[PDB]
Amino acid sequence: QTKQTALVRVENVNTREDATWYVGKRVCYVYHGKKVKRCVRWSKAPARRSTTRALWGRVTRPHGNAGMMRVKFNGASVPASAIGRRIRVYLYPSQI
Amino acid sequence: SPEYTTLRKSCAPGAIAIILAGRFRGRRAVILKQLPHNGPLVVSGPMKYNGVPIRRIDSRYVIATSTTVDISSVDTASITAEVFQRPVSDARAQLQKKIDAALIAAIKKDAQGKEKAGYLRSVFTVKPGDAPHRWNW
Amino acid sequence: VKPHLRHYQVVGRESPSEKNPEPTVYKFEVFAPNFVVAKSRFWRMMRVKNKVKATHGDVLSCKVVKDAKLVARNYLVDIAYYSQRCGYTRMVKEFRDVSKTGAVSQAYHDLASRHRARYHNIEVLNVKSIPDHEVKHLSIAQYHAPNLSFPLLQRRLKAARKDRAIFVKKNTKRAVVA
Amino acid sequence: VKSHYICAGRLVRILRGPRQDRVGVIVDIVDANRVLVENPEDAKMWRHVQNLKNVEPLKYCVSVSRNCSAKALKDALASSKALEKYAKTRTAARVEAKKACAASTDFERYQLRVARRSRAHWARKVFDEKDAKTPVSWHKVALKKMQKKAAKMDSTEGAKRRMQKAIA
Amino acid sequence: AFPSRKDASRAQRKSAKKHRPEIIVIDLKDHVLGRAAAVVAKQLLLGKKITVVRCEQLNIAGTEIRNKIKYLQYLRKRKLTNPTKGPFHHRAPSDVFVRTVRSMLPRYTKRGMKALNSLVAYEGIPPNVVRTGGRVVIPRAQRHVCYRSERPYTVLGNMCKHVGWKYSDVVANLEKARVEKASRHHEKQAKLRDAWKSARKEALAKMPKHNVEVLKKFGYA
RNA sequence: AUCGAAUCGCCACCUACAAGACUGGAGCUUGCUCCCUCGAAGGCGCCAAGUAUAUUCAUGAUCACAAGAAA
RNA sequence: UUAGGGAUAUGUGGCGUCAAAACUUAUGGGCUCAUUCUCGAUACGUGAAAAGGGUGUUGGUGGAUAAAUCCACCGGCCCCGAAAAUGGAUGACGCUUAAGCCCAAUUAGUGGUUGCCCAUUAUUCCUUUGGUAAGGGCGGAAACAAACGGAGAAAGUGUAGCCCUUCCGAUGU
RNA sequence: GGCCAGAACCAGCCCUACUGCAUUAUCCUGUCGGGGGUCAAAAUCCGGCGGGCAAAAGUGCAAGAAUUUUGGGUCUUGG
């Protein structure tokens, strides 16, 4: 396996034409750590301070032939501990 | 070089928008102007319906729905790039009241869906089994 | 879908020479997916039957011949093919179909299924649509009975490709996993 | 489920391909799998071979011989009024109504969303307007908690309830 | 109790509410064995929690004497020198299925045993799952689709009866037992279901009339 | 009590059964016609307890794990 | 056919799960049921089978008697022929409206015209190193203090390479 | 701020959408003879004689400037 590009099955997207709509969207992987580390709005909005974390990426292109769409997690790869768990595909940047 | 738009033509002033990110998620809101350079749009809802104040929202974080309003009765020119400079202020406080109160009527002048008011009071959730990628907007 | 074999008319001759000026310009019908496959199977019959070879020959034109408007017809296709068991059996069969190509390309699929012969060992001797009363085989003789009607039994209904829905809730159409 | 048949003319709708929900008239029969179908009233549903896997016959049959000249077909659809019969069919209601769900502008999906609450809000009142008949597990077991006033309306709670409410 | 006293003590110390994860429950009557197991195996690698149910009624293609022999050829294979370590042979149909799945999973990696451990099979429909939600089905694994009706087939529970799965009668008596208890309760509800089904058409009348034209458009009327 | 958590659809209408050479009901002529509820829909949820006259929201300052947690 | 990396595309081989690709593609045609080494299913790989048989089924050729039937012969798949020593192998599970065999196609008589996945390959971009390497600059143009646009510029095989632009190659007992 | 994020614009590169020239006749469509079937016709089918453009075909080639006020991608390049 080449660990740069993930593969994501996003629910209720079952065909290739349905994947090209998502090229460019920003995926997220919302795992958590143990101790609470630094965070994007730290001390601006201290109520976000918590154990949860996220890794971000973008949807590079449809993989497969039915609803399957590759991903680039920017500058790195996702853990292999993420396989089979929840990835988040947002609706932005909107092309509409 | 002074003022021009590369903004998509499908996002005009007056188009109802669905805000995809930020403190206001899924609250629908009214696209009002584009700032002088390629700017963030200034969306406005009569805060009275949604709760969305006058804010900056760039093109890519929002969806522009096909339903517009007639905004030609609202004065946009009173929103410049300066009003957002420092970082409840009276200068900002009553800049709502001269738009929201000016915009509400421009809603009530519609026909055929004279009330978008109900439509502006709502949220856009993606519920299980939506597939928003098949939808028209 | 549409047949996989186009219907070509290939016309060619030997290149003229002091020994044989004005060669005799043969015409030929092939069913082939390309016109190079039609142009190849033309120079096969030319050296096999006429002794003229492709390096000494000329091709006058390769154009396809278009098929008549679609109606249900009974086509009579007479085919040979090579085996090495039986050494060139020759066959005459009928096919229900709407066009010459659609019948002949259907005959290549049956020879390949029943007799396992693959397009290069096969050569079609002739094809024509025949009137109804000449259908010998009771299997194709049954489709021109008027008032012919049958239901559709033991079907398999594939939903729209967008609707496939791996897990569908029982006795309902609601898709739990799609 | 009704089987119907494949005869010279059933009306039939296509299941899948580029002509999807469009209806057509069976005309001829080509072997087992293949069938020709024309609907003159809808151009683009012209004379073409169709494959019976894609073709689901419905209950209306126009009367024509095999291989009609299509002016005999056009008049026979007229006289039969099959396409106007099928127009008020409850499925053809949806199939025409399904095309209108895909084309929704999200304001429309608001308009539907509004309705399906109204239809739901009144059906919650209309149903709840039957108190004279009570069958819901909240309202019915209350009816089962009734008649237990004996051990309640007797001397026990008679004083007890006059102690309790006074404290309130 | 199965839960430790502490995660009962913790759940009570943090209070909140009882929890159940989102779980799929697939009926399995007349689903082809090897097709239904593949589809399940690929949904277990995607992180789904699946409860298979009614494994007894799974089907296989071909005669019953034939598929008996296939399983008996599977009994013939044991470790000769120490069979207690020889390949194991499960009888009960719920076990036949979790094997047909398992051998289709990478069971020797921690994600292969993490997928398998999320599947739960059963005989019949146990009370643990009778009423939670609605049973789901796998339409590409179904028998009336996959098999020509002309071909003989088997019922997994009848095949496994004549190998060492002796619980067959105990299950048949629990299926006869529930399907009554359900259909007694089902027809009992027919008084209620018809009330609602009536209250929608009765509401469509006094509902505001510009909405009902929408329901007629988009089709729910 | 550490503990800050990844999860993001609820339901006392789905959560009964069966069939697929067939399951709305019927007639002879047995593939057609006629009748019905018209044979292709679990309900609900998606921001006023309800489609209409309303009503706090900002400064969390353009994205950031949803800064939210009993539908 | 292998310098160190990225992208796009492909070869041989593939798209039921293992396992990336048809979430088991088509709105493609046929044929096949195989009861204890368990029908079949990667060429090279007898890395397994023959002669001979079969009113199993599916085609064809020739002749013949007249409601259709009969005789001879030739194919296809399948079956019998077919017996070894540890439990065991289409790679495993399993598949039969094939996930098998022959043939064929690309979202399907609807408009022609590239379905999809994977290489240290091809194309291209960046970085290295070596050339039978190719070319340019190297006479300091002028101006210019701190305080409150900088710095180099070597006539050179090889260095922290005189500088720069370019082109091809790059694995190895 | 030499760190982390987004969003705009520029060159290059990649991708996708957008189509014309020829061609058709073993064809098109009348009609008259057959011929075929049916309760009776029509059709499939052969021939004659008229007319012609199936206006579209899975024919052969394709060059159609993607900021020439609007297609995408570049966290695969540099600004």
PDB file of N, CA and C (backbone and C1' of nucleotides) in Angstrom, chain G residues 143-173:
ATOM      1  P     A G 143      30.761  56.557 -10.162  1.00  0.00           P
ATOM      2  O5'   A G 143      29.342  56.327  -9.474  1.00  0.00           O
ATOM      3  C5'   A G 143      28.300  57.265  -9.671  1.00  0.00           C
ATOM      4  C4'   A G 143      27.103  57.016  -8.794  1.00  0.00           C
ATOM      5  C3'   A G 143      27.328  56.943  -7.303  1.00  0.00           C
ATOM      6  O3'   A G 143      27.631  58.192  -6.715  1.00  0.00           O
ATOM      7  C1'   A G 143      25.719  55.349  -7.947  1.00  0.00           C
ATOM      8  P     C G 144      28.600  58.255  -5.440  1.00  0.00           P
ATOM      9  O5'   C G 144      27.874  57.343  -4.360  1.00  0.00           O
ATOM     10  C5'   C G 144      26.672  57.771  -3.739  1.00  0.00           C
ATOM     11  C4'   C G 144      26.029  56.661  -2.946  1.00  0.00           C
ATOM     12  C3'   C G 144      26.816  56.142  -1.757  1.00  0.00           C
ATOM     13  O3'   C G 144      26.682  56.957  -0.616  1.00  0.00           O
ATOM     14  C1'   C G 144      25.982  54.325  -3.003  1.00  0.00           C
ATOM     15  P     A G 145      27.955  57.263   0.302  1.00  0.00           P
ATOM     16  O5'   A G 145      28.165  55.933   1.138  1.00  0.00           O
ATOM     17  C5'   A G 145      27.338  55.653   2.250  1.00  0.00           C
ATOM     18  C4'   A G 145      28.120  55.051   3.383  1.00  0.00           C
ATOM     19  C3'   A G 145      27.328  54.769   4.640  1.00  0.00           C
ATOM     20  O3'   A G 145      26.605  53.559   4.553  1.00  0.00           O
ATOM     21  C1'   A G 145      29.306  55.894   5.216  1.00  0.00           C
ATOM     22  P     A G 146      25.433  53.232   5.592  1.00  0.00           P
ATOM     23  O5'   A G 146      26.181  52.475   6.765  1.00  0.00           O
ATOM     24  C5'   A G 146      25.599  52.393   8.049  1.00  0.00           C
ATOM     25  C4'   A G 146      26.589  52.773   9.112  1.00  0.00           C
ATOM     26  C3'   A G 146      25.983  53.184  10.439  1.00  0.00           C
ATOM     27  O3'   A G 146      25.694  52.075  11.265  1.00  0.00           O
ATOM     28  C1'   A G 146      27.504  54.831   9.745  1.00  0.00           C
ATOM     29  P     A G 147      24.173  51.680  11.573  1.00  0.00           P
ATOM     30  O5'   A G 147      23.618  52.926  12.387  1.00  0.00           O
ATOM     31  C5'   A G 147      24.171  53.246  13.651  1.00  0.00           C
ATOM     32  C4'   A G 147      23.793  54.632  14.097  1.00  0.00           C
ATOM     33  C3'   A G 147      22.311  54.925  14.169  1.00  0.00           C
ATOM     34  O3'   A G 147      21.722  54.418  15.352  1.00  0.00           O
ATOM     35  C1'   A G 147      23.423  56.715  13.102  1.00  0.00           C
ATOM     36  P     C G 148      20.476  53.408  15.275  1.00  0.00           P
ATOM     37  O5'   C G 148      19.246  54.342  14.900  1.00  0.00           O
ATOM     38  C5'   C G 148      18.807  55.356  15.790  1.00  0.00           C
ATOM     39  C4'   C G 148      17.875  56.321  15.104  1.00  0.00           C
ATOM     40  C3'   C G 148      16.759  55.695  14.285  1.00  0.00           C
ATOM     41  O3'   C G 148      15.659  55.277  15.071  1.00  0.00           O
ATOM     42  C1'   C G 148      17.799  57.391  13.019  1.00  0.00           C
ATOM     43  P     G G 149      16.408  50.902  -0.278  1.00  0.00           P
ATOM     44  O5'   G G 149      17.523  50.734  -1.407  1.00  0.00           O
ATOM     45  C5'   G G 149      18.731  50.031  -1.147  1.00  0.00           C
ATOM     46  C4'   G G 149      18.470  48.750  -0.393  1.00  0.00           C
ATOM     47  C3'   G G 149      19.684  47.937   0.013  1.00  0.00           C
ATOM     48  O3'   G G 149      20.327  48.442   1.165  1.00  0.00           O
ATOM     49  C1'   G G 149      18.035  46.506  -0.879  1.00  0.00           C
ATOM     50  P     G G 150      21.918  48.309   1.307  1.00  0.00           P
ATOM     51  O5'   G G 150      22.129  46.918   2.051  1.00  0.00           O
ATOM     52  C5'   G G 150      23.341  46.202   1.896  1.00  0.00           C
ATOM     53  C4'   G G 150      23.197  44.744   2.253  1.00  0.00           C
ATOM     54  C3'   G G 150      24.352  43.860   1.827  1.00  0.00           C
ATOM     55  O3'   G G 150      25.464  43.936   2.690  1.00  0.00           O
ATOM     56  C1'   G G 150      22.347  42.841   1.182  1.00  0.00           C
ATOM     57  P     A G 151      26.912  44.228   2.072  1.00  0.00           P
ATOM     58  O5'   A G 151      27.345  42.845   1.436  1.00  0.00           O
ATOM     59  C5'   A G 151      27.394  41.687   2.242  1.00  0.00           C
ATOM     60  C4'   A G 151      27.373  40.434   1.418  1.00  0.00           C
ATOM     61  C3'   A G 151      28.469  40.287   0.393  1.00  0.00           C
ATOM     62  O3'   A G 151      29.710  39.947   0.965  1.00  0.00           O
ATOM     63  C1'   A G 151      26.431  39.622  -0.554  1.00  0.00           C
ATOM     64  P     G G 152      31.019  39.957   0.056  1.00  0.00           P
ATOM     65  O5'   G G 152      31.045  38.497  -0.555  1.00  0.00           O
ATOM     66  C5'   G G 152      31.869  38.190  -1.659  1.00  0.00           C
ATOM     67  C4'   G G 152      31.218  37.171  -2.552  1.00  0.00           C
ATOM     68  C3'   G G 152      31.861  36.992  -3.907  1.00  0.00           C
ATOM     69  O3'   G G 152      33.006  36.176  -3.866  1.00  0.00           O
ATOM     70  C1'   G G 152      29.544  37.197  -4.177  1.00  0.00           C
ATOM     71  P     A G 153      34.401  36.768  -4.360  1.00  0.00           P
ATOM     72  O5'   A G 153      34.306  36.678  -5.939  1.00  0.00           O
ATOM     73  C5'   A G 153      33.898  35.477  -6.562  1.00  0.00           C
ATOM     74  C4'   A G 153      33.409  35.720  -7.962  1.00  0.00           C
ATOM     75  C3'   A G 153      34.296  36.579  -8.835  1.00  0.00           C
ATOM     76  O3'   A G 153      35.397  35.880  -9.368  1.00  0.00           O
ATOM     77  C1'   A G 153      32.074  37.296  -9.047  1.00  0.00           C
ATOM     78  P     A G 154      36.832  36.579  -9.379  1.00  0.00           P
ATOM     79  O5'   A G 154      37.825  35.438  -8.901  1.00  0.00           O
ATOM     80  C5'   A G 154      39.200  35.475  -9.254  1.00  0.00           C
ATOM     81  C4'   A G 154      39.746  34.096  -9.517  1.00  0.00           C
ATOM     82  C3'   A G 154      39.202  33.422 -10.759  1.00  0.00           C
ATOM     83  O3'   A G 154      40.168  32.488 -11.212  1.00  0.00           O
ATOM     84  C1'   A G 154      38.558  32.185  -8.877  1.00  0.00           C
ATOM     85  P     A G 155      41.386  32.972 -12.126  1.00  0.00           P
ATOM     86  O5'   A G 155      40.977  32.456 -13.568  1.00  0.00           O
ATOM     87  C5'   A G 155      40.613  31.096 -13.730  1.00  0.00           C
ATOM     88  C4'   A G 155      40.766  30.629 -15.147  1.00  0.00           C
ATOM     89  C3'   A G 155      42.143  30.820 -15.762  1.00  0.00           C
ATOM     90  O3'   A G 155      42.410  29.746 -16.652  1.00  0.00           O
ATOM     91  C1'   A G 155      40.541  31.973 -17.034  1.00  0.00           C
ATOM     92  P     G G 156      43.216  28.466 -16.134  1.00  0.00           P
ATOM     93  O5'   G G 156      42.131  27.657 -15.315  1.00  0.00           O
ATOM     94  C5'   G G 156      42.327  27.328 -13.951  1.00  0.00           C
ATOM     95  C4'   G G 156      41.069  26.743 -13.372  1.00  0.00           C
ATOM     96  C3'   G G 156      40.538  25.518 -14.094  1.00  0.00           C
ATOM     97  O3'   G G 156      41.127  24.318 -13.617  1.00  0.00           O
ATOM     98  C1'   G G 156      38.803  27.093 -13.818  1.00  0.00           C
ATOM     99  P     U G 157      41.650  23.180 -14.626  1.00  0.00           P
ATOM    100  O5'   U G 157      40.698  21.940 -14.332  1.00  0.00           O
ATOM    101  C5'   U G 157      39.467  21.790 -15.019  1.00  0.00           C
ATOM    102  C4'   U G 157      38.951  20.375 -14.941  1.00  0.00           C
ATOM    103  C3'   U G 157      38.344  19.945 -13.617  1.00  0.00           C
ATOM    104  O3'   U G 157      37.002  20.371 -13.463  1.00  0.00           O
ATOM    105  C1'   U G 157      39.828  18.284 -14.363  1.00  0.00           C
ATOM    106  P     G G 158      36.415  20.694 -12.008  1.00  0.00           P
ATOM    107  O5'   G G 158      36.947  19.504 -11.103  1.00  0.00           O
ATOM    108  C5'   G G 158      36.269  18.261 -11.031  1.00  0.00           C
ATOM    109  C4'   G G 158      36.887  17.381  -9.978  1.00  0.00           C
ATOM    110  C3'   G G 158      36.748  17.891  -8.559  1.00  0.00           C
ATOM    111  O3'   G G 158      35.536  17.467  -7.981  1.00  0.00           O
ATOM    112  C1'   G G 158      39.003  17.321  -8.974  1.00  0.00           C
ATOM    113  P     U G 159      34.499  18.532  -7.412  1.00  0.00           P
ATOM    114  O5'   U G 159      35.008  18.783  -5.934  1.00  0.00           O
ATOM    115  C5'   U G 159      34.198  19.458  -4.991  1.00  0.00           C
ATOM    116  C4'   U G 159      34.996  19.816  -3.772  1.00  0.00           C
ATOM    117  C3'   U G 159      34.481  20.978  -2.948  1.00  0.00           C
ATOM    118  O3'   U G 159      33.523  20.554  -1.992  1.00  0.00           O
ATOM    119  C1'   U G 159      36.856  21.100  -3.231  1.00  0.00           C
ATOM    120  P     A G 160      31.957  20.441  -2.326  1.00  0.00           P
ATOM    121  O5'   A G 160      31.312  21.615  -1.474  1.00  0.00           O
ATOM    122  C5'   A G 160      30.796  22.784  -2.096  1.00  0.00           C
ATOM    123  C4'   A G 160      31.226  24.027  -1.365  1.00  0.00           C
ATOM    124  C3'   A G 160      32.713  24.346  -1.462  1.00  0.00           C
ATOM    125  O3'   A G 160      32.892  25.759  -1.478  1.00  0.00           O
ATOM    126  C1'   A G 160      32.119  24.079   0.795  1.00  0.00           C
ATOM    127  P     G G 161      33.223  26.512  -2.853  1.00  0.00           P
ATOM    128  O5'   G G 161      32.534  25.619  -3.972  1.00  0.00           O
ATOM    129  C5'   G G 161      32.920  25.729  -5.332  1.00  0.00           C
ATOM    130  C4'   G G 161      33.335  24.393  -5.886  1.00  0.00           C
ATOM    131  C3'   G G 161      33.704  24.343  -7.354  1.00  0.00           C
ATOM    132  O3'   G G 161      35.040  24.762  -7.566  1.00  0.00           O
ATOM    133  C1'   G G 161      32.310  22.511  -6.800  1.00  0.00           C
ATOM    134  P     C G 162      35.540  25.311  -8.988  1.00  0.00           P
ATOM    135  O5'   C G 162      34.945  26.773  -9.072  1.00  0.00           O
ATOM    136  C5'   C G 162      35.107  27.676  -7.998  1.00  0.00           C
ATOM    137  C4'   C G 162      34.482  29.003  -8.312  1.00  0.00           C
ATOM    138  C3'   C G 162      33.068  28.945  -8.834  1.00  0.00           C
ATOM    139  O3'   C G 162      32.106  28.768  -7.816  1.00  0.00           O
ATOM    140  C1'   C G 162      34.329  30.359 -10.206  1.00  0.00           C
ATOM    141  P     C G 163      30.760  27.958  -8.133  1.00  0.00           P
ATOM    142  O5'   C G 163      29.869  28.999  -8.923  1.00  0.00           O
ATOM    143  C5'   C G 163      29.508  30.226  -8.326  1.00  0.00           C
ATOM    144  C4'   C G 163      28.814  31.118  -9.311  1.00  0.00           C
ATOM    145  C3'   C G 163      27.653  30.499 -10.055  1.00  0.00           C
ATOM    146  O3'   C G 163      26.468  30.439  -9.287  1.00  0.00           O
ATOM    147  C1'   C G 163      29.016  31.664 -11.570  1.00  0.00           C
ATOM    148  P     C G 164      25.421  29.252  -9.533  1.00  0.00           P
ATOM    149  O5'   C G 164      24.886  29.515 -11.004  1.00  0.00           O
ATOM    150  C5'   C G 164      23.955  30.553 -11.235  1.00  0.00           C
ATOM    151  C4'   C G 164      23.770  30.843 -12.697  1.00  0.00           C
ATOM    152  C3'   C G 164      23.042  29.791 -13.497  1.00  0.00           C
ATOM    153  O3'   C G 164      21.647  29.817 -13.290  1.00  0.00           O
ATOM    154  C1'   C G 164      24.912  30.537 -14.705  1.00  0.00           C
ATOM    155  P     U G 165      20.832  28.445 -13.227  1.00  0.00           P
ATOM    156  O5'   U G 165      20.475  28.173 -14.749  1.00  0.00           O
ATOM    157  C5'   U G 165      19.837  29.179 -15.510  1.00  0.00           C
ATOM    158  C4'   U G 165      19.960  28.928 -16.986  1.00  0.00           C
ATOM    159  C3'   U G 165      19.639  27.530 -17.460  1.00  0.00           C
ATOM    160  O3'   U G 165      18.255  27.256 -17.514  1.00  0.00           O
ATOM    161  C1'   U G 165      21.595  28.272 -18.514  1.00  0.00           C
ATOM    162  P     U G 166      17.736  25.760 -17.287  1.00  0.00           P
ATOM    163  O5'   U G 166      18.413  24.944 -18.470  1.00  0.00           O
ATOM    164  C5'   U G 166      17.872  25.026 -19.774  1.00  0.00           C
ATOM    165  C4'   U G 166      18.754  24.389 -20.816  1.00  0.00           C
ATOM    166  C3'   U G 166      18.756  22.880 -20.891  1.00  0.00           C
ATOM    167  O3'   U G 166      17.594  22.355 -21.498  1.00  0.00           O
ATOM    168  C1'   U G 166      20.949  23.695 -21.145  1.00  0.00           C
ATOM    169  P     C G 167      16.923  21.024 -20.914  1.00  0.00           P
ATOM    170  O5'   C G 167      17.772  19.857 -21.573  1.00  0.00           O
ATOM    171  C5'   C G 167      17.686  19.612 -22.964  1.00  0.00           C
ATOM    172  C4'   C G 167      18.774  18.687 -23.434  1.00  0.00           C
ATOM    173  C3'   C G 167      18.836  17.337 -22.756  1.00  0.00           C
ATOM    174  O3'   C G 167      17.879  16.421 -23.243  1.00  0.00           O
ATOM    175  C1'   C G 167      20.986  18.257 -22.815  1.00  0.00           C
ATOM    176  P     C G 168      17.128  15.429 -22.233  1.00  0.00           P
ATOM    177  O5'   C G 168      18.055  14.144 -22.225  1.00  0.00           O
ATOM    178  C5'   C G 168      18.269  13.410 -23.418  1.00  0.00           C
ATOM    179  C4'   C G 168      19.601  12.709 -23.409  1.00  0.00           C
ATOM    180  C3'   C G 168      19.793  11.670 -22.326  1.00  0.00           C
ATOM    181  O3'   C G 168      19.180  10.433 -22.607  1.00  0.00           O
ATOM    182  C1'   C G 168      21.650  13.078 -22.342  1.00  0.00           C
ATOM    183  P     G G 169      18.253   9.761 -21.494  1.00  0.00           P
ATOM    184  O5'   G G 169      19.277   8.926 -20.617  1.00  0.00           O
ATOM    185  C5'   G G 169      20.024   7.884 -21.214  1.00  0.00           C
ATOM    186  C4'   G G 169      21.353   7.677 -20.538  1.00  0.00           C
ATOM    187  C3'   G G 169      21.323   7.039 -19.166  1.00  0.00           C
ATOM    188  O3'   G G 169      21.152   5.639 -19.227  1.00  0.00           O
ATOM    189  C1'   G G 169      22.805   8.866 -19.150  1.00  0.00           C
ATOM    190  P     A G 170      20.410   4.858 -18.043  1.00  0.00           P
ATOM    191  O5'   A G 170      21.291   5.171 -16.761  1.00  0.00           O
ATOM    192  C5'   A G 170      22.556   4.549 -16.586  1.00  0.00           C
ATOM    193  C4'   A G 170      23.214   5.002 -15.312  1.00  0.00           C
ATOM    194  C3'   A G 170      22.665   4.367 -14.042  1.00  0.00           C
ATOM    195  O3'   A G 170      23.714   4.222 -13.091  1.00  0.00           O
ATOM    196  C1'   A G 170      22.379   6.700 -13.942  1.00  0.00           C
ATOM    197  P     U G 171      24.342   2.778 -12.793  1.00  0.00           P
ATOM    198  O5'   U G 171      23.085   1.913 -12.377  1.00  0.00           O
ATOM    199  C5'   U G 171      22.342   2.233 -11.212  1.00  0.00           C
ATOM    200  C4'   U G 171      21.716   1.005 -10.611  1.00  0.00           C
ATOM    201  C3'   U G 171      22.676  -0.135 -10.320  1.00  0.00           C
ATOM    202  O3'   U G 171      23.369   0.004  -9.095  1.00  0.00           O
ATOM    203  C1'   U G 171      20.857  -0.967 -11.529  1.00  0.00           C
ATOM    204  P     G G 172      24.877  -0.519  -8.971  1.00  0.00           P
ATOM    205  O5'   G G 172      24.826  -1.996  -9.550  1.00  0.00           O
ATOM    206  C5'   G G 172      24.505  -3.102  -8.721  1.00  0.00           C
ATOM    207  C4'   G G 172      24.952  -4.394  -9.351  1.00  0.00           C
ATOM    208  C3'   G G 172      26.441  -4.519  -9.595  1.00  0.00           C
ATOM    209  O3'   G G 172      27.115  -4.952  -8.424  1.00  0.00           O
ATOM    210  C1'   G G 172      25.259  -5.150 -11.541  1.00  0.00           C
ATOM    211  P     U G 173      28.596  -5.563  -8.467  1.00  0.00           P
ATOM    212  O5'   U G 173      28.364  -7.125  -8.581  1.00  0.00           O
ATOM    213  C5'   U G 173      28.111  -7.902  -7.423  1.00  0.00           C
ATOM    214  C4'   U G 173      28.445  -9.347  -7.660  1.00  0.00           C
ATOM    215  C3'   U G 173      29.907  -9.633  -7.902  1.00  0.00           C
ATOM    216  O3'   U G 173      30.608  -9.781  -6.686  1.00  0.00           O
ATOM    217  C1'   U G 173      28.595 -10.720  -9.539  1.00  0.00           C
TER     218        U G 173
END
